[PDB]
Design a protein around this ligand. Structure first.
Ligand SMILES: *[C@@H]1O[C@H](CO)[C@@H](O)[C@H](O)[C@H]1NC(C)=O
Ligand SMILES: *[C@H]1O[C@H](CO)[C@@H](O)[C@H](O)[C@H]1NC(C)=O
Ligand SMILES: [Cl-]
Ligand SMILES: [Cl-]
Length: 271
């Protein structure tokens, strides 16, 4: 997995063809001087830009893209954990049965935060303005669709996609939550309200794990005043502190707490 954002702004991958099936080639960033995004404009790899033609999103568009006249990149690996894909929608029955609403200022988190309040574990955005909530495991009923088909911008934030009509983009409602209990072998903990701009803690507990490996593919804390803690859940000894993190570390427990005073922290446990 190579993005932990909703718009792939973190993506640094190799792909230089907009579509893996039937794609036009990407022009090189250094040769993009004519266009606003140039290796000159951003140096030493800022914005992921570099002497290459790989797909990138240096302007907070909804998704990675590259110049050609300019096109989105369809990348399977670029999908934030928490995002279940985007699926087709052919009307009733809808993919998420439970509830619906519409907002002119809708954003991925607003939709999530909304479904979370009803206690639905799944949320969907359609056409930029429609939010749907369900506990349906079969949101994939109508079939999986390419990611680019979900790129309609959220009306509340144009940096994020909210799906296109007949196309719905699915999020686990745990994303961005203020706290939570985590049981799976691995998952990602996102800063609260992620993807949109309180203090909260997350308890990660996996029975019979010898150790857990932590990872911070996204670290973006605004001030040293702000801080992220990791804590042994049994004793509450501090295993790490961070302010405004080397690539990984292993913790030899099955019970840890994440405390925050965005970021994405990926934990992958060993049984
Ligand atoms: C894509 O990038 C690779 C190196 O990562 C390069 O060898 C290749 O020529 C590029 N492909 C195209 C079609 O531009
Ligand atoms: C950009 O870098 C590529 C790869 O080294 C090179 O082929 C291209 O001509 C470069 N041009 C400039 C102006 O930096
Ligand atoms: Cl269709
Ligand atoms: Cl909350």
């Amino acid at each position: 997995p190579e993005c932990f954002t909703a718009n792939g702004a973190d993506y640094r991958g190799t792909q230089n063809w907009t579509a893996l099936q039937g794609g036009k080639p990407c022009l090189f960033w250094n040769e993009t001087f004519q266009h606003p995004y140039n290796t000159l404009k951003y140096p030493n790899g800022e914005g992921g830009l570099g002497e290459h033609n790989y797909c990138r999103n240096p302007d907070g568009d909804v998704s990675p893209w590259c110049y050609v006249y300019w096109k989105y990149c369809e990348i399977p690996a670029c999908q934030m954990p928490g995002n279940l894909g985007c699926y087709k929608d052919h009307g009733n029955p809808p993919p998420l049965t439970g509830t619906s609403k519409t907002s002119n200022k809708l954003t991925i988190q607003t939709c999530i935060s909304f479904c979370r309040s009803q206690r639905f574990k799944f949320a969907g955005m359609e056409s930029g303005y429609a939010c749907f909530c369900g506990n349906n495991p079969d949101y994939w009923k109508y079939g999986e669709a390419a990611s680019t088909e979900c790129n309609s911008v959220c009306f509340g934030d144009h940096t994020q996609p909210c799906g296109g009509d007949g196309r719905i983009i699915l999020f686990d409602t745990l994303v961005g939550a203020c706290g939570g209990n985590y049981s799976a072998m691995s998952s990602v903990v996102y800063s609260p309200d992620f993807p949109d701009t309180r203090v909260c803690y997350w308890t990660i507990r996996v029975p019979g794990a010898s150790h857990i490996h932590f990872s911070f593919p996204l670290f973006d804390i605004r001030d040293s005043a702000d801080m992220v803690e990791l804590l042994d859940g049994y004793t509450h000894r501090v295993l790490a502190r961070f302010h405004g993190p080397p690539l990984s570390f292993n913790v030899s427990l099955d019970f840890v707490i994440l405390y925050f005073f965005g970021f994405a922290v990926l934990y992958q446990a060993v049984k």
